[PDB]
Write an enzyme that holds these catalytic residues in place. Structure first.
Site, PDB file in Angstrom:
ATOM      1  N   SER A  46       1.847  10.306   1.671  1.00  0.00           N
ATOM      2  CA  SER A  46       1.938  10.261   0.303  1.00  0.00           C
ATOM      3  C   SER A  46       2.659  11.575  -0.051  1.00  0.00           C
ATOM      4  CB  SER A  46       0.886   9.871  -0.409  1.00  0.00           C
ATOM      5  OG  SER A  46       0.498   8.781  -0.405  1.00  0.00           O
ATOM      6  N   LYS A  49       5.761  11.961  -2.129  1.00  0.00           N
ATOM      7  CA  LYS A  49       5.881  11.554  -3.610  1.00  0.00           C
ATOM      8  C   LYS A  49       6.089  12.672  -4.558  1.00  0.00           C
ATOM      9  CE  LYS A  49       3.098   7.789  -2.544  1.00  0.00           C
ATOM     10  NZ  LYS A  49       1.987   7.154  -2.099  1.00  0.00           N
ATOM     11  N   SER A 106      -0.801   9.164  -6.491  1.00  0.00           N
ATOM     12  CA  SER A 106      -0.374   8.621  -5.147  1.00  0.00           C
ATOM     13  C   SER A 106       0.035   7.296  -5.259  1.00  0.00           C
ATOM     14  CB  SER A 106      -1.399   9.107  -4.120  1.00  0.00           C
ATOM     15  OG  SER A 106      -0.653   9.146  -2.815  1.00  0.00           O
ATOM     16  N   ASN A 108       1.527   3.635  -5.081  1.00  0.00           N
ATOM     17  CA  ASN A 108       2.434   3.180  -4.219  1.00  0.00           C
ATOM     18  C   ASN A 108       3.445   2.155  -4.846  1.00  0.00           C
ATOM     19  OD1 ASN A 108       1.887   4.140  -1.504  1.00  0.00           O
ATOM     20  ND2 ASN A 108      -0.144   3.198  -1.746  1.00  0.00           N
ATOM     21  N   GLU A 145       4.266   0.662   5.070  1.00  0.00           N
ATOM     22  CA  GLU A 145       4.529   0.856   6.506  1.00  0.00           C
ATOM     23  C   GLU A 145       4.725   2.409   6.845  1.00  0.00           C
ATOM     24  OE1 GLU A 145       8.263  -0.791   7.369  1.00  0.00           O
ATOM     25  OE2 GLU A 145       8.894  -0.500   5.195  1.00  0.00           O
ATOM     26  N   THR A 212      -0.793  15.821  -2.304  1.00  0.00           N
ATOM     27  CA  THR A 212      -1.479  15.599  -1.212  1.00  0.00           C
ATOM     28  C   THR A 212      -0.899  14.425  -0.296  1.00  0.00           C
ATOM     29  OG1 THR A 212      -3.096  13.968  -2.502  1.00  0.00           O
ATOM     30  CG2 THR A 212      -3.930  16.171  -2.091  1.00  0.00           C
TER      31      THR A 212
HETATM   32  B1  LIG Z   1      -0.790   8.168   0.430  1.00  0.00           B
HETATM   33  O1  LIG Z   1      -0.777   8.724   2.086  1.00  0.00           O
HETATM   34  O2  LIG Z   1      -1.799   9.170  -0.056  1.00  0.00           O
HETATM   35  C1  LIG Z   1      -2.657   8.675  -0.760  1.00  0.00           C
HETATM   36  C2  LIG Z   1      -3.073   7.207  -0.865  1.00  0.00           C
HETATM   37  C3  LIG Z   1      -4.212   6.743  -1.539  1.00  0.00           C
HETATM   38  C4  LIG Z   1      -5.059   7.734  -2.055  1.00  0.00           C
HETATM   39  C5  LIG Z   1      -4.750   9.340  -1.982  1.00  0.00           C
HETATM   40  F1  LIG Z   1      -5.545  10.295  -2.389  1.00  0.00           F
HETATM   41  C6  LIG Z   1      -3.781   9.594  -1.149  1.00  0.00           C
HETATM   42  C7  LIG Z   1      -3.375  11.029  -1.108  1.00  0.00           C
HETATM   43  O3  LIG Z   1      -4.120  11.694  -0.268  1.00  0.00           O
HETATM   44  O4  LIG Z   1      -2.731  11.720  -1.831  1.00  0.00           O
HETATM   45  C8  LIG Z   1      -2.139   6.153  -0.450  1.00  0.00           C
HETATM   46  C9  LIG Z   1      -2.058   6.300   1.169  1.00  0.00           C
HETATM   47  C10 LIG Z   1      -0.767   6.563   0.452  1.00  0.00           C
HETATM   48 CL   LIG Z   2      -1.533  12.839  -5.380  1.00  0.00          CL
END
Ligand SMILES: *[B@@]1([O])OC2=C([C]=[C]C(F)=C2C([O])=O)[C]2[C][C]21
Ligand SMILES: [Cl-]
Ligand SMILES: [Cl-]
Ligand SMILES: [Cl-]
Ligand SMILES: [Cl-]
Length: 267
Positions: A46, A49, A106, A108, A145, A212
């Site tokens: 993520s 982003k 984060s 999607n 993916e 993150t």
């Molecule tokens: B991404 O990789 O990051 C992410 C997700 C869900 C919850 C999260 F806290 C985070 C993150 O660590 O920023 C989804 C999987 C994508």
């Molecule tokens: Cl985040």
């Protein structure tokens, strides 16, 4: 020597949890840097982003998009982990809220919609990074993916150093004008998913903006932050991890500690 000692500590931490850590940090006051496997590739997860929202902000600034234009998606099947876009499905979101939800939660759905409509897909996202001088970053796939995190796979990866450079250029430097950078800064500041990572590595009254990533495979996780210590020039900290086995779980505490070591090395 405090650089070689930092290397020794990162190497120990990486063995301790049986995986691989990459770090790059910069003190923007002194220009001091510290890097550990800072040229090796890690999955973005993520984490891209945060750059996607900077791309949106650049388009708004070029007057190519409007931060208040409504984005509608009444019929979309929302990807998993669309916590924000799910609540507003019925009414739409502004471009600005959707971009900041990609960043701060984060989200999607936010991520994929913006890539399809505004940014030209993974290749437009990659192209935007080229436009700021980042030769390392590549995005190849869509959510979810892009989270596969297969060892030895180059798709959807970057280096710690390149990520650090990019965040510096976007968060601190010259790509975004005065008014627009403030917006991106405040976006990074209200990130909600990073309390256990870089933020945990720093005194309580330092201000932190971060983004993150969590692949959910190969214990792959990461964080990058802009750090304003009290009455001192900002720090850039970029921390990426992967783990040996597919079913490994990510380590927040390893990330926080890797941050602590990094911050000490530049201090
Ligand atoms: B991404 O990789 O990051 C992410 C997700 C869900 C919850 C999260 F806290 C985070 C993150 O660590 O920023 C989804 C999987 C994508
Ligand atoms: Cl985040
Ligand atoms: Cl990957
Ligand atoms: Cl954090
Ligand atoms: Cl991890």
């Amino acid at each position: 020597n405090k650089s070689d000692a930092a290397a020794k500590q990162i190497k120990k931490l990486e063995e301790d949890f049986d995986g691989r850590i990459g770090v790059f940090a910069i003190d923007t006051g002194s220009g001091n840097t510290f890097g550990y496997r800072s040229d090796e590739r890690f999955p973005l997860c993520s984490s891209f982003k945060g750059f996607l929202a900077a791309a949106v902000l650049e388009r708004v600034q070029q007057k190519k998009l409007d931060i208040n234009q409504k984005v509608k998606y009444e019929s979309r099947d929302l990807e998993y982990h669309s916590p924000i876009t799910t609540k507003y499905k019925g009414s739409g979101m502004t471009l600005g809220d959707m971009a900041s939800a990609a960043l701060q939660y984060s989200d999607n759905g936010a991520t994929n919609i913006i890539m399809e409509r505004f940014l030209g897909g993974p290749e437009g996202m990659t192209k935007f990074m080229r436009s700021i001088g980042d030769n390392e970053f590549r995005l190849d796939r869509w959510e979810l993916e892009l989270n596969t995190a297969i060892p030895g796979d180059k798709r959807d990866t970057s280096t710690p150093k390149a990520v650090a450079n990019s965040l510096n250029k976007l968060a601190l430097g010259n790509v975004l004008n005065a008014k627009v950078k403030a917006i991106y800064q405040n976006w990074l500041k209200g990130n909600t998913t990073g309390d256990a990572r870089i933020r945990a590595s720093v005194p309580a009254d330092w201000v932190v903006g971060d983004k993150t990533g969590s692949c959910g495979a190969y214990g792959t996780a990461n964080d990058y932050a802009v750090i304003w210590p009290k009455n001192r020039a900002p720090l850039i900290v970029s921390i990426y991890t992967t783990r040996k086995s597919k079913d490994d779980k990510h380590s927040d505490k390893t990330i926080a500690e890797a941050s602590r070591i990094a911050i000490q090395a530049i201090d």
